[PDB]
Design a protein around this ligand. Structure first.
Ligand code: ATP
Ligand code: MG
Ligand code: MG
Ligand code: MG
Ligand code: MG
Ligand code: MG
Ligand code: MG
Ligand code: MG
Ligand code: MG
Ligand code: MG
Ligand code: NA
Ligand code: NA
Lengths: 152, 66, 114, 177, 79
RNA sequence: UCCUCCUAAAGAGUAACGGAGGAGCACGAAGGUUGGCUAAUCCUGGUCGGACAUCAGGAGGUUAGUGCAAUGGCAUAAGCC
RNA sequence: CCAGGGCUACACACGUGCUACAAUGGCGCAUACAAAGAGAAGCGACCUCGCGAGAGCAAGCGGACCUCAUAAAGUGCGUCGUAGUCCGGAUUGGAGUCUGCAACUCGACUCCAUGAAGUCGGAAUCGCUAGUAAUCGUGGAUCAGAAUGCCACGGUGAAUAC
């Protein structure tokens, strides 16, 4: 049972997100029509709906990598976003050792003693930290992204 | 050198606000305008005038209006 | 913008973006703009380099972050090594202007500890 | 470079007259300039080694060698082979021009300028200097800086006596006391 | 902070410092006038200030020429 | 059961419930070859920097190093790239 | 009887309050609507000087007439766009004014600068039934100076009681 726990470096108050008139579509036109919402702090928003519809691409627009047709997305002032993409191959196509890949995201005020603690809690013991990052299991890769969110 | 691992090195026109036109090569790639140089540095006067705050007798005597 | 240390805040009215300098408040900020002919309502982003140039030199009349943070540091240090009563209060971290230390004075004492 | 010509035109004759030499080769001369940046806390933050390397390659147009620890010392929890700092050795015309663009603009910009000590000598004719900050050099645009790291300059000359090495550095308008 | 009337010093101490500068340095002067300011002329003396029960001797120096005499005599103890 | 030193009496060997320590492996490089390199420890000058980190000189000389215990070796290096 | 100090001390705990944590708010400009009370070593217009606390001359008044004395919330326009912020105002440095023989211990107020805790408060607990609660300002006693306390006056003005 891996020990995962996300903390928060700088808590932010009042609204955390606001989306005003976010109509967007690729070639069907209204992927989502006239979206309008305001997301507070502490919300746990589960976006449902199932298949081919913009179940994703909402998250992609919120992070910005998918430009919207019309509308503006105003993140909070200090909002720091940890993104766990559905398709995360691009961050492992580059072939670094697991230790270096987890060490990319070390922050100001921590060691590679504290870098390896995340991998230890994520059950990468002594040899599975020497594998190329490319050759890892799907779950062993989702966990390695969880340990990047935890680290950031 | 070792085949383009070092940064680029081209001549720049370093000039002071008081002049001091010099033609040096530096790792900036864009010209700079900065303060005085050692040619006209106030080393014989800056440290002489560095001490300015001090002496409460004249402050006391300046208020002496009575 | 860029004034003595950094006048980084844009999108702020110049009368108020100037406050972010250590030594420039509100009425001293208003004197700077008035003596340089810039309107208060005008944002720093709208403020072109044609008037920032005469804004950098305007602040030079008054003391600023680098000098002031030492100018007062000498003043506090002057009392402590002098041995005055106000110097004694500075050493122990107690109120200096003669106020209650019986129950209040948590700003100078610090956090409440047992 | 300009300082090389200045030396080989004026200082040779000046010092031959002063010290009563007999050959042009006897008067001392600058041999190299060694710049180091001992970050120490590379183990605390390895990417700060890359930041320091960028800063020193900006200061002097040469890539830094990343030095490694030599002995496993238990006073700071580092062992053999651990990268500790960066270093650059400057010789020739690059050395001369870095010397020039130190003396002319980098030295006067130090806050609270008093004067470089004349007792910072090793007893054989070499000079060492700490600068306390790299912003004093014009190579940083207040953008790469997250630390206030400084350089160590070591001017290594072929002088044999410390009084001989003093006059050579004096003749180059060094900001002594 | 006594406005435009000038600096205040007790009369019995004005003559004490005056008649003491004439003959140079002597034994410390004993005074209870804590409220009297330190004029520039009394520099170098060791006037003894009465903090309630004992006289503490203060060596008057250049920097101490605007503060009152009692500013340099703690009148209560602690620890 | 195996390895190293002393007892072991300057060839080999040599006992005791004699005095001391180790092994039941490791390494696709810590194997082969070619090219190069030389340590510990202090003594003097500098940002955090400290008795001890990195830099530059000098003394020293192999007092270091050897995947693992001890002995014998090792500069033509068997030590380090 | 006198001078100086103490009642103002500060690891801490408690009670009663003031100011806040902001947008039905902060700031700038302009303009309305009160009641009650005090004044002779006292209140002190108008004018001039000072960024300001105040200073110089100085009329009127022991008074429904003179002065303290400009009510503030409000209303209209403009800006700030959710930030420790154009919120908050502690703390601190420098420069002063005024009472008072005298402002260091130990006064009030003013100017310039720094700008902290604080982003609605655990168990628990208090006040209020109508011009009341909440909020906004005004005056008096004490008093040379020194109240966020006490006493007193008005403006806006609710919710609910099965
Ligand atoms: N990169 C792209 N280029 C072109 N069209 C795209 C791209 N990504 C998505 N689309 C189109 O937009 C639609 C929206 O896809 P979306 O990612 O929202 O689906 P989804 O509900 O998350 O799917 P699933 O659960 O199957 O992953 C797609 O079905 C496709 O038609
Ligand atoms: Mg034998
Ligand atoms: Mg034999
Ligand atoms: Mg036999
Ligand atoms: Mg081997
Ligand atoms: Mg070989
Ligand atoms: Mg070999
Ligand atoms: Mg009492
Ligand atoms: Mg009356
Ligand atoms: Mg806080
Ligand atoms: Na998807
Ligand atoms: Na798989």
């Amino acid at each position: 049972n891996p020990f995962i726990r996300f903390e928060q470096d700088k808590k932010l108050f009042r609204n955390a997100l606001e989306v005003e008139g976010l109509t967007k579509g690729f070639d069907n036109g209204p992927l989502f029509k006239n979206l309008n919402l305001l997301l507070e702090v502490g919300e746990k928003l589960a976006v449902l709906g199932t298949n081919g519809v913009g179940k994703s691409t909402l998250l992609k627009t919120l992070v910005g990598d998918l430009q919207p047709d019309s509308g503006t997305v105003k993140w909070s002032e200090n909002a720091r976003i940890g993104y766990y993409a559905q398709d995360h191959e691009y961050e492992f196509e580059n072939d670094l050792t697991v230790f270096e890949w987890m060490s990319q995201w070390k922050q100001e005020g921590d060691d590679e003693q504290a870098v390896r603690s995340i991998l230890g809690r994520l059950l990468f013991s002594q040899d599975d930290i020497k594998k190329p990052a490319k050759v890892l299991s799907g779950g062993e890769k989702g966990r390695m992204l969880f340990g990047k969110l935890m680290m950031q | 050198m070792k085949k383009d691992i070092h940064p680029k090195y081209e001549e720049i026109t370093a000039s002071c606000s008081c002049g001091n036109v010099m033609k040096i090569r530096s790792t900036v790639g864009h010209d700079l305008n900065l303060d005085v140089c050692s040619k006209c540095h106030p080393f014989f006067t800056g440290k002489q005038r560095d001490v300015a705050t001090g002496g409460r007798v004249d402050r006391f005597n300046k208020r002496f209006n009575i | 913008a860029r004034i003595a240390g950094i006048n980084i805040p844009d999108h702020k009215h110049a009368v108020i973006a100037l406050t972010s300098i250590y030594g420039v408040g509100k009425t001293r900020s208003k004197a700077i703009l008035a003596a340089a002919g810039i309107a208060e309502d005008v944002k720093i982003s709208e403020l072109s380099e044609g008037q920032i140039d005469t804004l950098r030199d305007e602040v030079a009349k008054f003391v600023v972050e680098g000098d002031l943070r030492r100018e007062i540091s000498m003043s506090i240090k002057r009392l402590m090594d002098l041995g005055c009563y106000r110097g004694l209060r500075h050493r122990r971290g107690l109120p200096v202007r003669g106020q209650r230390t019986k129950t209040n004075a948590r700003t100078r004492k610090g956090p409440r500890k047992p | 470079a300009k300082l090389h010509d200045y030396y080989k035109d004026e200082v040779v004759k000046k010092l031959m007259t002063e010290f009563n030499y007999n050959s042009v080769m006897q008067v001392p001369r600058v041999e190299k300039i060694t710049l180091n940046m001992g970050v120490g806390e590379a183990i605390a933050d390895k990417k700060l080694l890359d930041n320091a390397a960028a800063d020193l390659a900006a200061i002097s147009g040469q890539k830094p060698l990343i030095t490694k620890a030599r002995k496993s010392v238990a006073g700071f929890k580092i062992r053999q082979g651990y990268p500790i700092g960066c270093k650059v050795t400057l010789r020739g015309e690059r050395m001369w021009e870095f010397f020039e663009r130190l003396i002319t603009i980098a030295v006067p910009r130090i806050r609270d300028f008093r004067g470089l000590s004349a007792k910072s000598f090793d007893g054989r004719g070499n000079y060492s200097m700490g600068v306390r900050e790299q912003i004093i050099f014009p190579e940083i645009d207040y953008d790469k800086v997250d630390r206030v790291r400084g350089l160590d300059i070591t001017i290594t000359t072929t002088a044999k006596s410390d009084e001989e090495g003093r006059a050579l550095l004096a003749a180059f308008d060094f900001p002594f006391r | 902070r006594s406005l435009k009337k000038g600096p205040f010093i007790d009369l019995h101490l004005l003559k004490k410092v005056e008649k003491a500068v004439e003959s140079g340095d002597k034994k410390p002067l004993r005074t209870w006038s804590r409220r009297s300011t330190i004029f520039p002329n009394m520099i170098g003396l060791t006037i003894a200030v009465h903090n309630g029960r004992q006289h503490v001797p203060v060596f008057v120096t250049d920097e101490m020429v605007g503060h009152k005499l009692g500013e340099f005599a703690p009148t209560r103890t602690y620890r």
